């Protein structure tokens, strides 16, 4: 099922979804305002409010509060990327993406408890909070050579894999759907969420490539070639990590990631994420929202 | 009765209030927890927790939830600070460097997402859709107000004062006060206390910002009641000053003139008086309890504030 079909499968839900954002976000300030249009009419794929229709229709949900969950999602994510986009001594503006940052935080935790289910309030709950939590530990490793691929997963997982996995669960909650096919949805989520962060660092490498690098920012792809390559690669790649400002070094960094299969390597892992994100969703009755919830896990890990 | 009265009579919960802080800052990422210590044990006040514990106190409350809610309702004023701070550029903050100049805008900003995450968990761990409800809308309130003073008048300034100051306290008291059950009466008492104290409680602050952190108000030209009541009665060279520093939004280096200003007008004390009285319809409020030594603190700390 190719992404046209899950479009226009998905598209009435979506439209809720987008009404649902101009509602939560109209204005005073021309900021949050055009932020409002910004979001729905982004040509983007939209991926994490799709994965919340598409998991409560999935388990037979009627009913249109999946629709507020996919847009709280979406405010969520929004909100990590205004705040990620905060500059240190190095230097919208730090001010402006704190506040809006915040507007729509809150925003988003308004929306919870509207829903009035305190299990679904738990869950979003430790969510966000295992977000924030991410970003720090992510901040903590900009430029650590030394942290584990363990710290690593931990971090995709954090900042990344459970914003999906509390966006399919919640909509099977509150579409009262059994504890298997919660489970099912969970893991979909948190697996898919892992493969999308995978391919997403590894095609950094492939808005430009090399932010990563040049941030010192150690993913998987450039840890692999580290552990693996040859001491002089080692080293290279250490010394970018730690210094920062290595952009110029992609190619050299790209000669030791073919080399040793880092990339690959990396592609591989997403692979078997997407994999273990579509076996999570056997449980559930075949459909052809399930469908889409597959051609989505495909979708994401394909090249 | 008065702060040396109230606080051994509340001090064995905002011990607990401490305790139940303190022990949020569990991570396993370190760095929230080091930015947590440094900017939860720099003295504080603890007046918005205080309040709530006070609240539940005197409407009968005789656990040991009332705790945890002061707990993460500090939590969620310190989350304001680390942001504040940022958005300010602020360098200083009572006596030590802020938490950004001390650990940088990111860390700031993200253990202040930490923080205020947490509290949340906190607040759906208690259990009650009605706190998360009120919580939640007062909080966003807050947002809402600090995203429009991004992006002049006596009315105009009484509603941002309200925003992001009065709100805060409006539900801390209001939330101790639903935690315990109380009645819908005692809630909309609570509830205005809350929100006249933190009215009054800012008019107080504002007028200390002249001399008695110190001059940042007059520094970026805001427009504080002290010094629009200044521009409004003072001579009209005082009058184009004041409000050119406004339009400015920079008075730097004015504080003298400004100050001759309010003294020639008596607009500081003037604002010593529109806040006294909001603590007199703040303690008025309260007539709706019981009689009680907690109600007496509240009563107590209205008076302190002004």
């Given at each position: 099922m190719n992404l046209e079909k899950i479009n226009e499968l998905t598209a009435q839900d979506m439209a809720g979804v987008n009404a649902a954002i101009l509602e939560q976000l109209n204005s005073d300030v021309q900021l949050i305002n055009q932020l409002g249009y910004y979001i729905v009419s982004?040509?983007?794929?939209?991926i994490r409010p799709m994965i919340a229709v598409l998991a409560a229709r999935a388990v037979g949900?009627?009913?249109?509060?999946h629709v507020t969950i996919a847009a709280l999602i979406e405010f969520i994510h929004t909100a990590t990327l205004l705040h990620d986009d905060v500059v240190d001594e190095s230097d919208f503006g730090n001010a402006a993406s704190v506040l809006v940052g915040d507007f729509i935080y809150t925003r988003a935790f308004q929306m919870m408890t509207s829903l009035g289910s305190l299990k679904v309030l738990e869950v979003m709950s430790e969510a966000v909070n295992v977000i924030a939590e991410g970003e720090v530990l992510q901040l903590m490793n900009v430029?650590?050579?030394?942290?584990?691929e363990e710290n690593y997963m931990r971090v995709i997982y954090s900042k990344t894999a459970r914003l999906f996995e509390a966006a399919a669960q919640c909509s099977g909650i509150l579409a009262g759907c059994t504890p298997e096919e919660e489970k099912g949805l969970q893991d979909y989520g948190r697996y898919l969420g892992t493969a999308f962060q995978l391919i997403d660092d590894l095609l950094d490498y492939n808005?430009?490539?090399?932010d990563d690098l040049n941030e010192g920012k150690p993913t998987l792809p450039l840890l692999h070639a580290m552990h693996h390559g040859t001491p002089e690669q080692a080293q290279m790649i250490r010394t970018a990590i730690e210094?920062?400002?290595?952009?110029?070094?992609l190619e050299p960094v790209l000669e030791a990631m073919n080399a040793c299969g880092s990339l690959e390597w990396t592609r591989q892992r997403a692979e078997e994420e997407a994999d273990k994100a579509i076996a999570a969703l056997?449980?559930?009755?075949?459909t052809p929202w399930r469908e889409a919830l597959i051609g989505l896990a495909h979708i994401a890990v394909q090249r």
């Open positions: 982004g040509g983007g794929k939209r949900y009627e009913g249109n509060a430029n650590d050579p030394d942290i584990t808005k430009n490539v090399g210094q920062g400002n290595g952009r110029h070094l056997q449980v559930l009755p075949d």
